[PDB]
Design a protein around this nucleic acid. Sequence first.
RNA 1: GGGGAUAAGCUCCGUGCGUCGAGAGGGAAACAGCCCAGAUCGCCGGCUAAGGCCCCUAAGCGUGUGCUAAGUGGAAAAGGAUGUGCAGUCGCGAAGACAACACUGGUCAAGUGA
RNA 2: AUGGUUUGGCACCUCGAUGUCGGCUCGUCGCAUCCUGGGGCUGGAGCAGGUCCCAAGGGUUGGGCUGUUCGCCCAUUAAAGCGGCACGCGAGCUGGGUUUAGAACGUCGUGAGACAGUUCGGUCUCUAUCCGCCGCGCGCGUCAGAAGCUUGAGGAAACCUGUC
RNA 3: ACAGGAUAACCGCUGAAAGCAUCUAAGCGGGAAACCUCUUCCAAGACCAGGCUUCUCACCCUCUAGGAGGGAUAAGGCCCCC
Lengths: 165, 59, 209, 146
Amino acid sequence: SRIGKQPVPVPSGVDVTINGQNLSVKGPKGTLTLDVAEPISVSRAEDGAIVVTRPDDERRSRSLHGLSRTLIANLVTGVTEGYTQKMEIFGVGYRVQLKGQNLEFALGYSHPVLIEAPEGITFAVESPTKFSVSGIDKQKVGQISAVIRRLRRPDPYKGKGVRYE
Amino acid sequence: NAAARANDITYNRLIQGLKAAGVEVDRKNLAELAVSDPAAFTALVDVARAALPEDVNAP
Amino acid sequence: RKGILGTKLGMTQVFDENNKVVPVTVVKAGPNVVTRIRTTERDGYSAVQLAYGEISPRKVIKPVAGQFAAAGVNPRRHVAELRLDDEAAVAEYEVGQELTAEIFSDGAYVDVTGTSKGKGFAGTMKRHGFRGQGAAHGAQAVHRRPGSIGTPGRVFKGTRMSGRMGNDRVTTQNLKVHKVDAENGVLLIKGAIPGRNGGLVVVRSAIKR
Amino acid sequence: PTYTPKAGDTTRSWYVIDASDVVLGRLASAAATLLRGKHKPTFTPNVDGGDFVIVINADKIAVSGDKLTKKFAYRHSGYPGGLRKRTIGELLEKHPTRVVENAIIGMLPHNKLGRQIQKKLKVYAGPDHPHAAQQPIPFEIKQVAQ
RNA sequence: GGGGAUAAGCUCCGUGCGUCGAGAGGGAAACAGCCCAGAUCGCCGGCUAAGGCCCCUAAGCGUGUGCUAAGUGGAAAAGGAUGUGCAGUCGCGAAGACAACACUGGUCAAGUGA
RNA sequence: AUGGUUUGGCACCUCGAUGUCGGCUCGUCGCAUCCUGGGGCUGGAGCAGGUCCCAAGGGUUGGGCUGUUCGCCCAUUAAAGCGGCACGCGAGCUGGGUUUAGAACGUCGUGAGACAGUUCGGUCUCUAUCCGCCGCGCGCGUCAGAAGCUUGAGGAAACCUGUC
RNA sequence: ACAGGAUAACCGCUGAAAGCAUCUAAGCGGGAAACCUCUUCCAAGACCAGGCUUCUCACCCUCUAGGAGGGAUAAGGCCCCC
């Protein structure tokens, strides 16, 4: 509610296209498309922003209003500069490196472990122990980051595995 | 009921209007009119419409 | 998935290169001629129809003779359909093309489909493997009967009771082809394939292996 | 005495109903009334003097609440444990027409006359029907204000 | 009201209490004992009772003002529970309130707590 | 608070007949899960458990004693589940127990006799009308009469597991 | 069996109401011998009685010419026979 009432600024250099509720944005980092909920309309404010206008104050709309605002903010900040997630390992003998487009780890299992890189993300490994992933959409980056985090069961005893900064 | 809804009026409102208008034809002959002579039934629907109050939901 | 129509000849014995014995059933995978193409745009499903067996032209009735003439091939005794998956799979068959035994290779896994032998009216002991009752210790004329049939006082559907047995289409899966004799159009299939000698069978590439 | 239809009295007309974004129960009741012949002044419970009904855009139909994933369509094969259930979601995505057919069929009488009346209902998931030759009259669900 | 475990479709008494028994008809899906109502016979007439008016099924997908998100409606308790509507209080607060960054100071910006 | 799986209480149902326990044969259902499957915290180091949520697809042994259910025991096993259905199933079987008439012991009675005490013996009838179910035909229908090859709405079957 | 889909307990991602937080009220993912497909079989009496084809694709008589009835045939089938 409160956050939604504040229009999110739109940088000049990034193109925003509005087709009813289908909103598409072309930024320097790439392009992303968002669909807005039907009780709320979005119009690009002429001052270099977009208007998240909620016309009703019933629970559904009042809850969706701020959510729509923050989703739009995430979309614009992800199409402008993208999103980057930093990762690392703790323990010994745990090696990580990038093999082309695909990520291979040797956590200590009897078999090599490979992770497939989906679209919109790329893997950076400047050290075997620490490495990072970056993308233009925050949701996908978070999902893949959690997936790679899952490669070891939690260790409350030694803390061997992977953890965020 | 079928013939009255064909004339954009419900059966109960039609019966109330017919009662208010004072016409003393019964349901047997009302059905006979509805089947045989639609013109008479339409005229009866008009007279019942005229006999109805202006706001039927008024107290 | 390849396929062919054949005939069960009998079973015999062979030895592989480790001197082990292999009981092999001999199937006459005789020459089949493709008679019709089933296409999705025409029939709604993709399938290929094969004809097998040799029959005298004076034995075929007029509708069958007309169908074979429209295909463009001489009549055969038996006709069956092979159901494929998509048009890309059925594009490799065309009417009049002849399939012989060498479409299979040694060591391949095949699916033979046939009609089981007839056993006639069979009791529950034979039809369903019911354990019998006692042959002594007082049992009175119940040595082979099913026994109980078991609130609503109703015999539920599916009751495994006595009846006719056999004569049903049966598929045996993952049979290994020990040898493909190209000269006689004979497949040597390790194992036992359904039906009596001289019956019709269908040999298809295994769906599982 | 009261009028009674003869051999050649009944005349049929064809209506086509667009089920896009229409409440399932509402459309089912309207179509059931049309099939039964209740809208004709010549109506008689003995005769199926109804009209043929075509329903297009069956898959676009509207279901309120969370009935799309919580309402079950049941059927028993007769064998023990032969009970099968599908929610309206999978029923719609697999056999779109079946939901509307079941709804309409449940709302008309369960006699033999109901069985004969069922013959006069055609539903289609697509936006078009093969019955253009009959020139069906588009039908809209209105309410008679009283 | 007693007996029984104030349990029983248990048992035993009182009642210018009722119904059935000996009572059809309408309603409660079906349903002696509940609700409406006491059948002299006929009518292809009318008004109503209980109960009802989306379709089955006769009559309202009636009108106006609100509530419910649980298919609650369309079974049930001790107890548990930041659901929501209304109303009443109190605490703190532009001297800048709460949050955010036990109790105190700076940014911030109206409501924030029981 | 649930259930009517345990003994109950009522006597509504049957005395011009509703078979009483176990066992065999054959089932079907529930999940309040014995194994197998997915989990979580561990007072979980690993192994292995403890406890708990989901989960009913399949499986869930053979013998000794007793008429037995129950139970104890012997070997195993992945495991040797708990229950409903007239404590399923005698126009399907048994008759070992209980429940007639014979006889004996203990005890009670003067006695005839008796004992929800014991012991030995002791007729289990029927040609399936209807529903139900398993199979198999005849007739008609599917808008002329036929014949090949088929799609499949919809159902049925199967689903276990160990060691190395 | 393998493989796919939707899921349970559960693990999550992206975040509101409630300026933070919150696997959640919007959404998006993973997740079991259970469920839907997948394997085998029956299946158009599936009365919505289906489909692709192929064959025969014609001859009389009667009442009264409206319809019906009867006869003889084709493709084919059955009976008799082995």
